[PDB]
Ligand binder design. Structure first.
Ligand SMILES: NC(=O)c1ccc[n+]([C@@H]2O[C@H](COP(=O)([O-])OP(=O)(O)OC[C@H]3O[C@@H](n4cnc5c(N)ncnc54)[C@H](OP(=O)(O)O)[C@@H]3O)[C@@H](O)[C@H]2O)c1
Ligand SMILES: NC(=O)c1ccc[n+]([C@@H]2O[C@H](COP(=O)([O-])OP(=O)(O)OC[C@H]3O[C@@H](n4cnc5c(N)ncnc54)[C@H](OP(=O)(O)O)[C@@H]3O)[C@@H](O)[C@H]2O)c1
Ligand SMILES: NC(=O)c1ccc[n+]([C@@H]2O[C@H](COP(=O)([O-])OP(=O)(O)OC[C@H]3O[C@@H](n4cnc5c(N)ncnc54)[C@H](OP(=O)(O)O)[C@@H]3O)[C@@H](O)[C@H]2O)c1
Ligand SMILES: NC(=O)c1ccc[n+]([C@@H]2O[C@H](COP(=O)([O-])OP(=O)(O)OC[C@H]3O[C@@H](n4cnc5c(N)ncnc54)[C@H](OP(=O)(O)O)[C@@H]3O)[C@@H](O)[C@H]2O)c1
Ligand SMILES: *C(=O)c1cccc(-c2[nH]c3nc(N)nc(N4CCCC4)c3c2C#N)c1
Ligand SMILES: *C(=O)c1cccc(-c2[nH]c3nc(N)nc(N4CCCC4)c3c2C#N)c1
Ligand SMILES: *C(=O)c1cccc(-c2[nH]c3nc(N)nc(N4CCCC4)c3c2C#N)c1
Ligand SMILES: *C(=O)c1cccc(-c2[nH]c3nc(N)nc(N4CCCC4)c3c2C#N)c1
Lengths: 250, 249, 250, 249
């Protein structure tokens, strides 16, 4: 029987590449998404055409609220519903926008940035563990620049720091249940075609290894490693995939 | 004119020692509290008996909610209203209890532990900044955050986010001349009512004297960071833990 | 044609496991050793029996001294001599013993512990770089417990910190040449018969992931990842392979 | 009677500023130096003019060698010989120059950069402990160790090693009441002789005031760590960097 994974925010970009790569490795996948319904269904179609009945979509808002625990539990439930098991959880979904200290309310900024980046991963991790030869693991998508943060992104940065804290705490506490917990910390990756060519090149030049952002495949390679049998002693570890960006001083 | 400080969770223990020591240095203080009303009031009395019109109290729940921004703004307002200025913020209030991954609801646990330890500090920081000399914020962190207590994952997530705020706010608020730093205790002031074997177990692991920190020892590191001797220091977290975080399993 | 790797301290334990796994993936290997000549020679013999002339040995004390720079240069030389190229360097050899602050002289303690653990890795790194779809990389064997160090192992711990520094500095400096530099930080692995039973039991019991030590092959897995094509954007990273041990408080 | 401090590389710049402040706080001091003989004696003169018999010089090369342990033991011995005691060791001396991977032999580069920045501090610390109240060591680290200067690999390796010593020695020496801590500058007191443009390049990157630290600002942090306000702080490293280490590329 093929193991099954949940990838949050999987309809596009790095989450999509993670889902594709896990599918290519033999996983059945729950493609979770929030607003990108067309991209999600189109991805699930391509994967199921490749192998029947090995991909489903699952919609959920991961903004913090009093029903967020039930939403997270239902994402987990959808994987058991569809495939009878849940071996891997990848927490990739993330809100990302500036929140200067000096048109969303601050309440909403808090709920979106802290919810997606930290509270949802915590509640999904609860639900993952509670619901449980086997190679069980969680991979959190962290951020290699967490200690040299982007100006005015304080709530985003707080959320990613909390995610490292969850990675550690959960690796510690889920170790006796055989569940490993680790992270992948991207530097700059897959800059949106949207963004100006001059701004993208600004970021690119700073990266020592090749003066280029990471491809989505490159991030995904690190995730595949941590879920594999090749990482069975690895827990509480966070792998930077940043081309040395975090080593460059101002 | 004497500078003014807000101290959250200041009615008891480390927050109290922090308020007293700032007061002793010349600060006027806002004593924030949540449930410890008598202790907050008795402390203001004691400080005002030393120097009159130098201490007030302000009650607020710092649980995450749709009204937390406004409560935080009022905590800062209460310092301006009483004293005409606000030079220092100490983010000390903290909820602390286990939250196992496997009778409060989980959303309440989330609200309390992430609210007190991180979101409230962020909102207070925003309100403090927005209103703006030697300005500085000191956040009470945790020396054990990378070797955390089993089953305290929300508390640890909150403390990790607080370091993130410390760094981010230090970076963003530097052009205003506001420094943002942290003080990370190890074990301090273990309650009389905790187990004797339990406390002993922690105390014995502490390399520097086999004992917990007193509250005054934590307060010392705060005072230093707010002082004129810390004018170039921002984004730094001082461990005050007797070497405890250095000790392997 | 086939890439080539230098592995230091490769005769026994983790270093041997590394050398074997690189050889299995198709590398030719220089097995460096210091005192373990019988094991080093046997290992190269076994590897050569598998694929002809794909393995050579090279002996060198990596203690710090005036001749250490030429020894390190001859080790790299030995890989170009044998195989025409040197794609991978693995810095694994390490002296390890207590040096209390309060009968080798202390200057010999310095020379051994800092030499093997830091200075030699630096000199091999220089010689590796000076000699230079290609995939060049260095992997340094670090230590997961470096911030919670063993009582009375100051010089060991100083050496390992220095190795972290090299990892970071060299990744930065060698990125423009296409050479990646990373590390792998074991927790406890392969505790020998020679070590006290009390002491061993104390360590194994503290490991969250399964209350046991890492196997050598478990450490080697992480090395193979880092040198692989699936790590092509990773440089300046250190992967803990420690079973969660470094997350456990006193 | 007054306590005593050894300060390495104390003739000029930050070490001098540290020696001066310890002296102003009441310490007697050993001004160690290697080539700056004239500045060193000139400084001891001035300190003894203020209070007689409170300052000596001690010359030593702290390059790694088989005699380095003897030279380190002699520096501590010089403190007991002049003042009858040794309360504070400050490890400040440091070689700093590039050593690219791709006239000094590399063996000499290794010896100077690893000797001054790590091995000498380790052997000074050994000698300090064995020759033994508020006893403490302060190592001058570097806030930029994880984002290092290009081509400074032996320098960066030394400063990392020094972090590791700070930790190991805090752990091991705690049962003897010796605290071990560090101060990590960012950019401080850039050479008046270094190019203006280069200097402004670094100064512009510093969030807190777009300027380097004064030597006095670094010393303030040292002074705190040796003081009675830091009695429970060991194994801690205080960044004094104006936020420099927080700024991304
Ligand atoms: N890109 C980088 O350079 C970079 C750098 C550092 C770290 N990372 C981390 O790497 C991961 C992937 O990066 P990325 O650039 O691919 O991410 P992204 O495009 O910014 O976000 C990926 C997905 O997150 C989901 N998401 C956003 N808000 C949500 C909400 N309220 N509820 C549920 N889902 C929500 C979105 O789903 P829908 O589109 O379906 O609405 C989105 O497609 C993230 O965790 C990110 O923080 C990325
Ligand atoms: N004690 C230690 O060993 C230790 C170790 C590591 C870090 N720390 C940190 O150091 C700081 C002080 O430690 P401590 O032991 O003195 O703290 P504490 O006694 O646990 O709590 C400090 C105060 O937090 C306030 N507080 C709690 N929940 C609140 C809420 N929902 N809303 C508003 N205020 C709330 C309480 O005020 P009321 O009493 O008025 O209700 C309490 O008096 C904390 O931030 C703590 O996390 C302490
Ligand atoms: N074992 C653990 O649990 C653990 C924990 C943390 C980190 N590590 C690290 O992981 C790596 C491998 O661990 P291990 O347990 O396999 O190492 P190890 O057996 O202690 O040492 C590996 C090899 O180092 C070589 N070596 C020692 N001194 C030397 C010298 N002066 N010159 C040249 N070579 C010298 C030896 O070669 P000869 O036998 O040929 O003399 C030895 O076989 C090491 O870097 C170690 O520090 C291991
Ligand atoms: N300045 C900065 O921006 C900065 C930044 C990061 C960290 N730090 C650290 O803070 C400390 C002080 O910095 P600084 O800029 O004042 O230092 P510095 O001027 O570079 O060095 C201080 C002294 O070190 C002594 N020294 C050099 N090589 C020696 C040797 N082989 N043996 C014995 N002594 C030797 C010299 O003594 P003589 O003059 O007597 O020969 C020199 O005066 C250093 O440890 C440094 O690494 C400084
Ligand atoms: C600042 O701290 C920082 C530095 C490098 C990269 C990021 C970053 N995090 C992101 N998270 C998410 N969820 N999305 C993005 N995307 C950027 C383009 C749209 C999606 C992130 C970036 C970037 N760049 C932050
Ligand atoms: C676990 O990670 C950990 C290790 C050492 C000390 C603590 C700790 N954090 C605390 N936070 C708050 N708000 N209060 C306390 N008090 C303990 C006694 C009651 C109040 C904290 C402790 C402790 N001990 C956590
Ligand atoms: C102390 O800080 C520490 C904690 C866990 C594991 C180690 C450790 N490092 C070692 N390095 C080397 N070169 N060898 C060993 N072996 C132990 C068995 C003989 C060789 C190391 C250990 C262990 N255990 C240090
Ligand atoms: C590079 O990693 C780096 C970044 C900021 C500051 C320094 C730095 N370290 C120094 N150590 C020593 N011993 N001396 C100096 N100075 C002497 C000449 C003027 C600078 C150091 C600097 C600087 N700048 C390194």
């Amino acid at each position: 029987e093929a193991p099954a994974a949940v990838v949050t925010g999987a309809a596009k970009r790095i989450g999509r590449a993670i889902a594709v790569k896990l599918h290519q490795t033999g996983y059945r996948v729950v493609i979770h998404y929030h607003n990108s319904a067309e991209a999600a269904v189109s991805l699930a179609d391509e994967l199921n055409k490749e192998r029947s009945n090995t991909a489903v979509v699952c919609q959920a808002d991961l903004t913090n609220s009093n029903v967020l625990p039930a939403s997270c539990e239902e994402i987990i439930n959808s994987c058991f519903r569809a495939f009878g098991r849940c071996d891997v959880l990848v927490n990739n979904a993330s809100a990302f926008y500036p929140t200067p200290l000096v048109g969303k309310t601050v309440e909403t900024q808090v709920a979106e940035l802290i919810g997606t980046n930290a509270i949802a991963p915590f509640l999904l991790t609860m639900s993952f563990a509670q619901r449980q030869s086997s190679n069980l693991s969680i991979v959190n998508l962290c951020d290699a620049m967490v200690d040299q943060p982007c100006m005015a992104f304080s709530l985003y940065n707080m959320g990613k720091h909390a995610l490292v804290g969850l990675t550690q705490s959960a690796a510690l506490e889920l170790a006796p249940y055989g569940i490993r917990v680790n992270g992948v910390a991207p530097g700059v990756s897959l800059l949106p075609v949207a963004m100006g060519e001059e701004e993208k090149d600004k970021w690119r030049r700073k990266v020592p290894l090749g003066r280029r952002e990471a491809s989505a495949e490159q991030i995904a390679d690190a995730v595949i490693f941590l879920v594999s049998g090749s990482a069975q002693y690895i827990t509480g570890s966070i792998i930077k995939v940043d081309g040395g960006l975090s080593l460059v001083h101002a």
